[PDB]
């Protein structure tokens, strides 16, 4: 009884984790966004110097 109560609590925790992770997976990645932000920042600095 005690182990199955703990098991259902851990199952609820896993379902909360999956519920947040599915919403996060509707958004694009993190590191690729950092790479394209670095590229856009370099291009914006070059365009600002040209302007």
């Amino acid at each position: 009884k005690k182990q199955i109560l703990q098991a259902k609590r851990i199952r609820k925790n896993r379902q909360e984790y999956d519920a947040l992770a599915k919403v996060i997976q509707h958004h694009p990645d993190r590191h690729e966004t950092l790479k394209e932000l670095e590229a856009l920042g370099k291009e914006l600095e070059h365009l600002s110097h040209i302007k």
């Binding site: 009884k1 182990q3 199955i4 098991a7 259902k8 199952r11």
Partner: protein, 49 residues
């Protein structure tokens, strides 16, 4: 004949005295079977969950 009567009375007394204890062992084993079915169902439920 008196000794035969005494022997049969003692044998019937011993037979009934075994039979009552057999009935009590059967009832207590039935309660143990109930509890083992409960344990097995809870174990199957936690392996499901």
């Amino acid at each position: 004949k008196k000794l035969n009567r005494l022997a049969h009375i003692r044998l019937k007394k011993g037979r009934d005295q075994t039979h009552e204890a057999k009935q009590k062992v059967d009832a207590y084993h039935l309660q143990l079977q109930n509890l083992l079915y409960e344990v097995m169902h809870l174990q199957k439920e936690i392996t499901k969950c």
